Design an enzyme around this catalytic site. Structure first.
Site, PDB file in Angstrom:
ATOM      1  N   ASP A   1     -34.726 -36.815 -45.206  1.00  0.00           N
ATOM      2  CA  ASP A   1     -34.462 -37.376 -46.381  1.00  0.00           C
ATOM      3  C   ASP A   1     -34.059 -36.156 -47.554  1.00  0.00           C
ATOM      4  O   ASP A   1     -33.350 -36.397 -48.395  1.00  0.00           O
ATOM      5  CB  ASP A   1     -35.557 -38.400 -47.070  1.00  0.00           C
ATOM      6  CG  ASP A   1     -35.315 -39.053 -48.385  1.00  0.00           C
ATOM      7  OD1 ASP A   1     -34.237 -40.003 -47.813  1.00  0.00           O
ATOM      8  OD2 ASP A   1     -35.720 -38.940 -49.400  1.00  0.00           O
TER       9      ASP A   1
ATOM     10  N   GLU B   1     -32.298 -40.934 -40.888  1.00  0.00           N
ATOM     11  CA  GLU B   1     -32.734 -39.633 -41.485  1.00  0.00           C
ATOM     12  C   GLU B   1     -33.490 -38.786 -40.670  1.00  0.00           C
ATOM     13  O   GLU B   1     -33.250 -37.635 -41.048  1.00  0.00           O
ATOM     14  CB  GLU B   1     -33.634 -39.998 -42.961  1.00  0.00           C
ATOM     15  CG  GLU B   1     -32.681 -41.023 -43.877  1.00  0.00           C
ATOM     16  CD  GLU B   1     -33.322 -41.067 -45.229  1.00  0.00           C
ATOM     17  OE1 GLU B   1     -33.477 -42.343 -45.830  1.00  0.00           O
ATOM     18  OE2 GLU B   1     -33.254 -40.207 -45.846  1.00  0.00           O
TER      19      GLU B   1
END
Ligand SMILES: [Cl-]
Ligand SMILES: [Cl-]
Lengths: 143, 144
Positions: free
Chosen positions: A42, A114
């Site tokens: 992220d 992610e």
């Protein structure tokens, strides 16, 4: 079967366990899941996309860059990219989680994507993770 | 005077105007300020610190990594780092903003620090920005 995923990414892992780790949903195995990699990924993606927008929209104010980034770095967008890679076919989750529709949960799909970007960053560095991520974004959002 | 700041950063700018840009508070001049560089630098710093912690705390869950990151990537900590660089001495702002204590505002100090890191990333890349950022962080906050 993860070879198909590597081919789709244009990235072949040196440590295959690292990709498997990124694909491991929290339901699957005690003390081994993709949450840490998702955290790392992220942060990678916020820089990838923030930098992309900074360059692309040289006259956009910070508020514009921020909101545009929120429109790209989010569960829906990442679940879309995940589905383009057939990630539901590769994610590892418990029988109960699968029976509860886990393979189609946007959060699970997004988190795995992610985590994969985080894993590529871990093995290969930011610039490599950036090129991989930008390709996926530009294929899914031809912005 | 700018050379003093570079000496403190242990980083010499290739494009000096880029550093100027990072030092330019939004009050100073129409349509030219450090807000975009601050945005970029904040993203750089979140990755630098997130990665540092990921490796340093190989066992920690995301919640614990996030708490440790919040302990480093925050206005108070960045203002402390900025003050260690005498950053207030270099930030460009209007007379009114300066009279209102702008060079002493932790938000302004923090923003300028983050903008500088953004600028380093822009000209020299992530790994160089990371090296500089970690030196500044470790020189101030070895306990985290
Ligand atoms: Cl991990
Ligand atoms: Cl700018």
């Amino acid at each position: 079967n993860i070879e198909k995923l590597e081919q789709s990414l244009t990235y072949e892992f040196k440590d295959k366990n690292l990709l498997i780790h990124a694909l491991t949903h929290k339901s699957f195995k005690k003390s081994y899941n993709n949450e840490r990699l998702e955290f790392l990924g992220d942060a990678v993606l916020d820089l990838v996309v923030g930098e992309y927008l900074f360059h692309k929209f040289a006259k956009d104010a910070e508020g514009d860059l921020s909101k545009l980034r929120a429109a790209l770095v989010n569960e829906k967008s990442f679940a879309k990219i995940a589905n383009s890679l057939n990630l539901g076919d590769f994610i590892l989750m418990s029988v109960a989680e699968e029976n509860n529709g886990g393979k189609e949960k946007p959060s699970i799909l997004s988190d795995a994507l992610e985590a994969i970007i985080g894993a590529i960053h871990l093995e290969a560095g930011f610039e490599f993770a950036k090129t991989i991520a930008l390709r996926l974004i530009e294929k899914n959002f031809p912005i």
